[model samples]
Target: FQDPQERPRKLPQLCTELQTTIHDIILECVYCKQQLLRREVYDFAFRDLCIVYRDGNPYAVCDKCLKFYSKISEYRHYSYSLYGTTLEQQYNKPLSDLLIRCINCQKPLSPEEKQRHLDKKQRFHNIRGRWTGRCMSCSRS
Candidate 1:
């Protein structure tokens, strides 16, 4: 009690830890705060979270949150589709980021990255409207 000058210091840390997960890998649920454990795309809300990755960043949401959040995403008098306010606003990508990578590729493509990729002059049409791209030279695709 006499030597009170020696005080312990607190170390800084992130609320969430980010590692090289994978491109478009939804490893957790933002709403329920649940871990994905495994990799997944999670298209319950039509990808309302855009649960994808790009440049080593997550998009948002897992299977649980996708469904849960979609169910809560109510519509107004103008429209009655579960989609959203507008085509650009579909899936509510700006909600809670949870998407990670492809699980197989580990590219790390965030939702923002996917949006950028889709803003090109022309779309070559992918398998089932993949919407997101794959890692270069990766065997995931």
Candidate 2:
């Protein structure tokens, strides 16, 4: 069980490396087939497909379909970091470069607001019947 060769690599290592010449590769959500931009790959609205399907190809789940599937108990305990890692490695940028937009105003979060906005306890703001991220000003108004 401890063999060096048998040990599995981390998800970040398993992500497909983007080639400079082939940077145009179009990625799609594995579940919905919706095209994804590099930034979208790391958004909270996306999730990595389970490791069981890793051998076939890299795959992701969009938020809309993921919610529906979760209600039916289709997916559970999937990795969120995998998408972040993939975006960082492929784009050669830090995770902070990925902007998190306000769910209400659609405004991008400033670096100063990013930490508080992502805090699970503080992130949710009730808008109509849905709970979603809202900037400080947006939350008040």
Candidate 3:
């Protein structure tokens, strides 16, 4: 009679967090025209497009595109209030150092002025991250 084969030992595995299934939304990157999971989309892509290009249509970009654009024009990557608290802490500093000039008045903004201007713009866009081409003073004319 053949000897019975020894059973393989099963080691117990520890699970830190509960595993749950989720259905992730798919989105297209407006710049690269690539399909991506919602989690793969950069948070500020849509806001950037709306504020800079005034493209109101719903749009998003993959992380790659965001990096590419950021490299090309560093100033294009303006920080918004919607970023996570950690990111806000890092980029919430004054834009005056960046030398962001007003498109209409051709005037430079100080730290305080930039904050006030952005606050006003936020109100105008209902805190949706949309902004005008001109500064508050120029926009009044």
Number of clashes in every candidate structure? 19, 0, 0
RMSD per model, one decimal: 14.6, 12.3, 19.1
Q: Model 1, 5-111: lDDT tens per residue? A: 32211111111233332333344454555666444432323222333333443334555554343334321111221211232375555412424332223334555
Candidate 2, superposed: residue stretches over 4 Å from native: 1-11, 19-26, 44-55, 74-141
Cα lDDT, all candidates: 0.34, 0.45, 0.39
Tens-digit lDDT track of model 2 for 3-32:
435432322333444332123444566777
Better of 1 and 2 by lDDT: 2
| Top candidate (TM-score) | 2
By TM-score: ranked, best first? 2, 3, 1
- How well is each residue in 18-83 modelled by candidate 3, as lDDT tens digits? 122223334456787677565553343222232111143323556677656544443454434332
| Model 1 spans > 4 angstroms off | 1-19, 23-27, 41-59, 75-141
TM-score of 2: 0.32
TM-score of each: 0.27, 0.32, 0.29
Clashing pairs in 3: none
Candidate 1 scores a C-alpha RMSD against the true structure in Å of 14.6
